[PDB]
Structure formats: C-alpha cells, structure tokens
C-alpha cells in the first residue's frame, strides 16, 4: 500500500527577533536563544515528541550563487549525518507552497543546552569528564570521516553538551568532501590545523584531529593551548610546543614565500609534553603527543585514537558505527543560482521525518 496524497501542515505566523517567523503548528512556545550572522535561532516545544528543539531560520540561503551552492551542500550533509554524537536534522521546512514562492529555509535540530565553552567556564573537568567528552567527539568524528567528509571547524562552540555530559558535533557549514579543491574560509584561528592556516596544501581529514588535540589540551589545562593574536603569533605558539619542522616537511606545507619566513625563525625542539600538562593522566599526554604533530601523514586518526588506552573505559569497537559514503557528484556541476535553489528545494521536499522510537 502506498500514499497517493500528501497533506501540507498548517503554518502560523508570529513576530520573533524582529521578523515574522512562519512555522508548522507542530512547533509551539517559540522563544529566541541564539544569534549569529546567518540565521537566528529559537527554542521551541516540539509537540510531535514533547521535547524541546532548536529552530533555525535561514533568510539568505540563496543570496548569491556562492551562498546557494553552499546551502545546498550543507543541507545534504545535514540530511546525511545520523549518529548519536553528531547533530541530526529533525525537520526542515519552508512556508512556501511552491518553488516560485520559495526563499526561507528553517532547520530543526535537538536543543542541547550548553556548548563546550560553557562547560569549561563553569568547572575544572575531571579526567573522567575529559575521557568521556573527547571519546564522544572522536566517536562522532570516526563517523563523519567515514562519510568522506572533513568537518574543518571543530572548536568548543561547535560542540553541544548536556547535563549528563553527552555531546554532539555541531555545524556543517564549512564541512567538505575530502576530494574537493577546498572552498570556503575557516576563520577559526586557535583550533585550526597549521596546514590549513598556511593555505598551501590540499589537506586531509586529520586537520580535524589537530582541532581535537587543541580542544583536549584546553579541557585538561583550563586555558586555550594556542591563543594566537594573529597568524605569526599562532605559528610561533605552535612551533614552541611541537618543535620546528624538518626542511622536507616544510616543502609540502608552506609556499616558498612562507617556508622562507619560517626558516627565518629561531629553531626550537619539540617540548616535553609532560611538563606542559603536568598532573594530567599520562595516557592523555601520550594521546595529545599523537594528535599534535605537524606532519599530517603521521597524525593519529579518529579510528586509531578510539583504540588508544586513554579511552579504555569507554571504547567499544562494536558500538562505534560508520557512515555511508557521501555522494558529492552534483557539486561538480556548474549551475546558476536558481538551479542551486531548485536543488535545495528538492532536498527540503524529499525530507524523510526520522521515525519515533
């Protein structure tokens, strides 16, 4: 038996954050929470499940061809990610009755309550919290990478945490397929892998591992590991810890006109990690040493990291699932702005509500 017919939900309008929000009657009790450059966010009561959700309104998704393509890609990635430690798409909708009426896009996700920044300011985390937090990031990351995707912007504000210390990776705005000639700018300075900052090489998924290292270091010490004030300070901060790279490694990671500058620097050896993270669990220190290396070919992977002894209390190889490969073929097409928009419209319309369990 098949459905011949579909019933559009009933929508209602109200003013929130200086604009009219128009959402299905399914969502009630909307109130603003978050503000960002691209879309305002409201908490809401999801009458379908009885749980609180975040509703993000996108009003500039197709402003330009660049915006439009990025919106399409991001929605496909969002629709793809189904994993406990990765943000899921509970719903996506538009009030538009047709493609011609289409502009605003609303995304609905779980409302977590805090991000990792919040958590850090409110406590010094125990080694157990750290184990469990980083473990979950890595479990989510193994899944994301197995989809052939690089997150590219892991940082505390992109990590949602609840009261029970459960975590989800947020924000796929900058995420890309590994095989891309990378577009988009990762603006985050403190958590960004050196090879990305140098903008010289086609980098790999281990850029996200670097980020995890910076985050873990920060959870252990209670302060940002590499809080550079600019590109130069950021570099010197990093080389101080990890030691200046051999000449060979240099060739691959920087342009000559950068390579030359680096060499211009006073050379420094790799620091003793135990002294930087004094009183940290020795296993944690060992793992940091495997993450925070300049050579991306030697950097430990997510799947490897999960099997590291530091996670012995949590590691379950039978419960660390992988994804289907993401198909990025449409993103090689050269399309006009309206065509990227029509494609996005298709993705919104074809959205399949997750089952209730």
UniProtKB/Swiss-Prot annotation:
It is found in: Cytoplasm; Nucleus. Activated by cell stresses such as DNA damage, heat shock, osmotic shock, anisomycin and sodium arsenite, as well as pro-inflammatory stimuli such as bacterial lipopolysaccharide (LPS) and interleukin-1. Activation occurs through dual phosphorylation of Thr-183 and Tyr-185 by either of two dual specificity kinases, MAP2K3/MKK3 or MAP2K6/MKK6, and potentially also MAP2K4/MKK4, as well as by TAB1-mediated autophosphorylation. PROSITE patterns: MAPK, PROTEIN_KINASE_ATP, PROTEIN_KINASE_DOM. Dually phosphorylated on Thr-183 and Tyr-185 by the MAP2Ks MAP2K3/MKK3, MAP2K4/MKK4 and MAP2K6/MKK6 in response to inflammatory cytokines, environmental stress or growth factors, which activates the enzyme. Dual phosphorylation can also be mediated by TAB1-mediated autophosphorylation. TCR engagement in T-cells also leads to Tyr-326 phosphorylation by ZAP70. Dephosphorylated and inactivated by DUPS1, DUSP10 and DUSP16. PPM1D also mediates dephosphorylation and inactivation of MAPK14. The modification N-acetylserine is found at residue 5. The modification N6-acetyllysine is found at residues 56, 155. Pfam families: Pkinase. It catalyses: L-seryl-[protein] + ATP = O-phospho-L-seryl-[protein] + ADP + H(+); L-threonyl-[protein] + ATP = O-phospho-L-threonyl-[protein] + ADP + H(+). The active site is at 171 (proton acceptor). One of its GO terms (biological process) is DNA damage checkpoint signaling. Changing residue 183 to A: Phosphorylation blocked. Macrophages, monocytes, T- and B-lymphocytes. Isoform 2 is specifically expressed in kidney and liver. It is an enzyme of class 2 (transferase). Its cofactor is Mg(2+). The modification Phosphothreonine is found at residues 19, 183. Component of a signaling complex containing at least AKAP13, PKN1, MAPK14, ZAK and MAP2K3. Within this complex, AKAP13 interacts directly with PKN1, which in turn recruits MAPK14, MAP2K3 and ZAK. Binds to a kinase interaction motif within the protein tyrosine phosphatase, PTPRR. This interaction retains MAPK14 in the cytoplasm and prevents nuclear accumulation. Interacts with SPAG9 and GADD45A. Interacts with CDC25B, CDC25C, DUSP1, DUSP10, DUSP16, NP60, SUPT20H and TAB1. Interacts with casein kinase II subunits CSNK2A1 and CSNK2B. Interacts with PPM1D. Belongs to the protein kinase superfamily. CMGC Ser/Thr protein kinase family. MAP kinase subfamily. The TXY motif contains the threonine and tyrosine residues whose phosphorylation activates the MAP kinases. This is Mitogen-activated protein kinase 14. It comes from Mus musculus. The gene is Mapk14.
């Amino acid at each position: 038996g098949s459905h011949m017919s579909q019933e559009r939900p009933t929508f209602y309008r109200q003013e929130l954050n200086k604009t009219i929000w128009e959402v299905p009657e399914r969502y009630q009790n909307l109130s603003p929470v978050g503000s960002g450059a691209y879309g305002s966010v409201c908490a809401a009561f999801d009458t379908k499940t009885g749980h609180r959700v975040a509703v993000k309104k996108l009003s500039r998704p197709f402003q330009s061809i660049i915006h439009a393509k990025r919106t399409y890609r991001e929605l496909r990635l969002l629709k793809h990610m189904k994993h406990e430690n990765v943000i899921g798409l509970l719903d996506v909708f538009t009030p538009a009755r047709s493609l011609e009426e289409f502009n605003d896009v609303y995304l609905v996700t779980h409302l977590m309550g805090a991000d990792l920044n919040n958590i850090v300011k409110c406590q010094k985390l125990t080694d157990d919290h750290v184990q469990f937090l980083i473990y979950q990031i890595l479990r989510g990351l193994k899944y994301i990478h197995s989809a052939d995707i690089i997150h590219r912007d892991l940082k505390p504000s992109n990590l949602a945490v609840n009261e029970d210390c459960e975590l989800k990776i947020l924000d796929f705005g900058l995420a890309r397929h590994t095989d891309d000639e990378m577009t988009g700018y990762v603006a985050t300075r403190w958590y960004r892998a050196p090879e990305i900052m140098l903008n010289w090489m086609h980098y790999n998924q281990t850029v996200d591992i670097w980020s995890v290292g910076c985050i873990m270091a920060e959870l252990l010490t209670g302060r940002t590991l590499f809080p550079g004030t600019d590109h130069i300070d950021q570099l010197k901060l990093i080389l101080r810890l990890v030691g200046t790279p051999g000449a060979e490694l240099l060739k691959k990671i920087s342009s000559e006109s950068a390579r030359n500058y680096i060499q211009s620097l006073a050379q420094m050896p790799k620091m003793n990690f135990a002294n930087v993270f004094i009183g940290a669990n020795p296993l944690a220190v060992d793992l940091l040493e495997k993450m925070l290396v300049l050579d991306s070919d030697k950097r430990i992977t997510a799947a490897q990291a999960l099997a590291h002894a530091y996670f012995a209390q949590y590691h379950d190889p039978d419960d660390e699932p992988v994804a289907d490969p993401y198909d990025q073929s449409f993103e090689s097409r050269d399309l006009l702005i309206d065509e990227w928009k029509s494609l996005t419209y298709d993705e919104v319309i074809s959205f399949v509500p997750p089952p209730l369990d």
